[PDB]
């Protein structure tokens, strides 16, 4: 695959864009996890699938019985890895671009995490879209967090929901989803 458009998909707590605490998301949003699954899995073309890209630490944090993520090509980045196809669902690579050279029959590409991946790849011009779930809570400060997005959003534009809907196709987009004390919305951003 040559110079594909890539999307980042993340869930962040406004306004600081907190994303984790000691390796874990500080919340359990059952519907939000479902949306992550549907978006990264659905495809429109026939014999295709999407690819998910993750850092080695996130891979390692998934229980072994739960990896690879089903129905998607999993790509794991490590600075120590050789570019290699492990099996039909797993690729090892040392760069995003090198990993993409090993694939065919991929419809979309998503970077899924973690923090270091997000923060480094946001500056790669292959990244064309951001799918940010913006989470809100009455007392954001009550939530312990150590990891944050460092995204240059002054250079990105938040699109209208119509554009997101077009993006995700048939997926149902509910507004102001509430779970416990959290309220969230799905958003799409593109580069200015
Ligand atoms: O705190 C911890 C949280 O970890 P978190 O940041 O969320 O983990 P990530 O899921 O983001 O994994 C980070 C790891 O990904 C690999 N990696 C990161 N950036 C790149 C890059 N630009 N190119 C190639 N490989 C890359 C490195 O693996 P390696 O260390 O194996 O190089 C790095 O340690 C616990
Ligand atoms: N919108 C969205 N985006 C993701 N990318 C999701 C992941 S994948 C993921 C992997 C790593 C991290 N983290 C960042 C740093 O370490 C805490 C874990 C967060 C999400 C798992 C569940 C729901 C998700 N929701």
Swiss-Prot record:
Reaction equation(s) it catalyzes: (6S)-5,6,7,8-tetrahydrofolate + NADP(+) = 7,8-dihydrofolate + NADPH + H(+)
One of the GO biological process terms: one-carbon metabolic process
SUPFAM superfamilies: Dihydrofolate reductase-like
Positions annotated to bind substrate: 32-37, 72, 112, 118
Full protein name: Dihydrofolate reductase
Record: residues binding NADP(+): 11, 18-24, 56-58, 78-80, 113-120
Top-rank taxon, per record: Eukaryota
GO molecular function: dihydrofolate reductase activity; NADP binding
CDD domains: DHFR
PANTHER family: DIHYDROFOLATE REDUCTASE (PTHR48069:SF3)
Species whose genome carries this gene: Candida albicans
Family note: Belongs to the dihydrofolate reductase family.
Entry function: Key enzyme in folate metabolism. Catalyzes an essential reaction for de novo glycine and purine synthesis, and for DNA precursor synthesis.
Gene name as annotated: DFR1
Keywords, sorted A to Z: NADP, One-carbon metabolism, Oxidoreductase
Occurrences of domain DHFR (ranges): 5-191
Pfam families hit by this protein: DHFR_1
Entry's EC annotation: 1.5.1.3
Metabolic or biological pathway, per its Swiss-Prot or TrEMBL entry: Cofactor biosynthesis; tetrahydrofolate biosynthesis; 5,6,7,8-tetrahydrofolate from 7,8-dihydrofolate: step 1/1
One GO CC term, this protein: mitochondrion
InterPro entries: DHFR (IPR012259), DHFR-like_dom_sf (IPR024072), DHFR_CS (IPR017925), DHFR_dom (IPR001796)
